[PDB]
């Protein structure tokens, strides 16, 4: 069940929102690591800009991730909405974000693990797009929003910009442009519309990060697309090919999936269900 947590609890569990428990801040607000009075290990997000972006993002998460549970989505355990304070409480994910692991410090992700992360994150997204009615459009898929639990299982997070779309529709007309530089679907720049195929594109970028080990802003999408006609054995993460040269065939197949996801035309991109089926076909 989703719990309504007393504000005093979150206050003392973070030692009065002390800098020492701060594990991230910016844009949306802060994220704190804590142990609740019952021993639960949690991440506590403190949203800022409550008079505007703050409340909207709070409501977006409550209306989406707050209403569903799935093995590849971060669990929202609780919330606190007192006065103009907006806090969201999640199960703590041991190894933080995929971006932290890939672009900082740390912990090594071999190809086997990265493949599981790719599959897991794809499954979470597929659940949003196909199993949920109304469908959920995440709108901010990226490596910092793929969390890794104690088993290095991928769990999709940050539904602050997520929206509900009727299953009878192919797109949703919105008020603003949502997303992150390096991940925005090209058609999002041209129209105030979002779609599940938009999430597919952004997922494609993440899959590229797993294959290359590079940041999207290095864009990466364009850099990989041009080398796809040059030398393919140049874009892959060196630490992946050093493991086993035999993995090259499997890497290129996953690369094909990423390229398909990253098509400029939304209508040509696969659904996340097609992506899963493709992953399954590669393993077999």
UniProtKB/Swiss-Prot annotation:
Domain (Protein kinase) ranges: 17-282
Resulting phenotype, residue 189 to F: No effect on kinase activity
Result of altering residue 180 to D: Loss of kinase activity and brassinosteroid signaling
Residues of the active site: 140
Tissue specificity annotation: Expressed ubiquitously.
Resulting phenotype, residue 203 to F: Loss of kinase activity
Consequence when changing residue 263 to N: In bri1-117; brassinosteroid-insensitive dwarf mutant
Phenotype upon changing residue 95 to F: No effect on kinase activity
Subcellular compartments: Cell membrane; Endosome membrane
Chain positions found as Phosphotyrosine: 90, 183, 203
Residue numbers of Phosphothreonine PTMs: 6, 14, 113, 170, 176, 180
Any further remark recorded for this protein: Binding of brassinosteroid induces intramolecular autophosphorylation of BRI1. Interaction with BAK1 activates both receptor kinases and the full activation of either receptor kinase requires transphosphorylation by their partners. Homodimerizes in the absence of ligand and binds brassinosteroid in the absence of its coreceptor BAK1. The bri1-9 mutation produces a fully active protein with a subtle conformational change that is recognized for reglucosylation by UGGT, resulting in its endoplasmic reticulum retention via Glc(1)Man(9)GlcNAc(2)-calreticulin/calnexin interaction.
Role: Receptor with a dual specificity kinase activity acting on both serine/threonine- and tyrosine-containing substrates. Regulates, in response to brassinosteroid binding, a signaling cascade involved in plant development, including expression of light- and stress-regulated genes, promotion of cell elongation, normal leaf and chloroplast senescence, and flowering. Binds brassinolide (BL), and less effectively castasterone (CS), but not 2,3,22,23-O-tetramethylbrassinolide or ecdysone. May be involved in a feedback regulation of brassinosteroid biosynthesis.
Family stated for the protein in its record: Belongs to the protein kinase superfamily. Ser/Thr protein kinase family.
Subunit structure: Monomer or homodimer in the plasma membrane. Heterodimer with BAK1 in the endosomes. Interacts with SERK1 and TTL in a kinase-dependent manner. Bind to SERK1 in a brassinolide-dependent manner. Component of the SERK1 signaling complex, composed of KAPP, CDC48A, GRF6 or GRF7, SERK1, SERK2, SERK3/BAK1 and BRI1. Interacts with CDG1. No interactions with PSKR1 or CNGC17. Interacts with BIK1. Interacts with B'ALPHA, B'BETA, B'GAMMA and B'ETA. Interacts with BSK1 and BSK3. Interacts with BSK5, BSK6 and BSK11.
Protein's UniProt name: Protein BRASSINOSTEROID INSENSITIVE 1
Organism the protein comes from: Arabidopsis thaliana (Mouse-ear cress)
Lineage: Eukaryota, Viridiplantae, Streptophyta, Embryophyta, Tracheophyta
From-to range in the entire protein, with total length: 867 to 1160 of 1196
